[PDB]
Amino acid sequence: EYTPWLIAGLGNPGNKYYGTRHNVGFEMVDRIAAEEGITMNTNQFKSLLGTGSIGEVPVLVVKPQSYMNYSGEAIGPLAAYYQVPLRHILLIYDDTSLPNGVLRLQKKRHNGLQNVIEHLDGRREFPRLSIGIGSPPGKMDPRAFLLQKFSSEERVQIDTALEQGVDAVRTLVLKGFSGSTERFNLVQKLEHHH
User: What does the domain layout of the chain look like in residue ranges?
Assistant: 1-194
Residues 6 or more apart whose Cβ sits within 8 Å of residue 168: 103, 105, 129, 184
Q: Computed over its alpha carbons, how large is the radius of gyration of the chain?
A: 16
Q: What angle do CA 108, 113, 116 make, to 5 degrees?
A: 95
Packing angle, helices 24-36 and 152-170, rounded to 10:
50
Identity (one letter) of the amino acid at 125? Answer: E
Burial class (CB in 10 A: 0-12, 13-18, 19+), 10: buried
Task: Decide if 193 is catalytic.
Answer: no
In SS3 terms, the chain reads as: CCCCEEEEECCCCCCCCCCEHHHHHHHHHHHHHHHHCCCCCEEECCEEEEEEEECCEEEEEEEECCCHHHCHHHHHHHHHHHCCCHHHEEEEEEECCCCCCCEEEECCCCHHHHHHHHHCCCCCCCCEEEEECCCCCCCCHHHHCCCCECCHHHHHHHHHHHHHHHHHHHHHHHHCCCCCHHHHHHHHHHHCCC
**CA-closest candidate to residue 146, choices 10, 31, 47, 30:** 10
Q: Edge-to-edge strands of the sheet including 103-106?
A: 42-44, 47-54, 57-64, 5-9, 89-95, 128-132, 103-106
Residues 6 or more apart whose Cβ sits within 8 Å of residue 38: 32, 50, 51, 52, 61
- From the annotation, which residues make up the binding site for tRNA? 17, 67, 69, 111
Measured between alpha carbons, how far is 20 from 175 in angstroms, rounded to an integer?
A: 31
Q: Please report the resolution in angstroms.
A: 1.8
The CATH classification of domain 1-194, taken from the options 3.40.50.1470, 3.90.700.10, 3.40.190.10, 3.30.70.260: 3.40.50.1470
Burial class (CB in 10 A: 0-12, 13-18, 19+), 153: exposed
Q: What angle do CA 133, 93, 124 make, to 5 degrees?
A: 130
The distance from CA 100 to its chain's CA centroid, rounded to whole angstroms, is 15
Burial class (CB in 10 A: 0-12, 13-18, 19+), 57: middle
Contact 10, 92 (CB under 8 A): yes
Measured between alpha carbons, how far is 81 from 73 in angstroms, rounded to an integer?
A: 13
Residue 100: C-alpha distances to residues 17, 18, 104, 190, 193 (Å): 19, 18, 11, 12, 11
Measured between alpha carbons, how far is 157 from 159 in angstroms, rounded to an integer?
A: 6
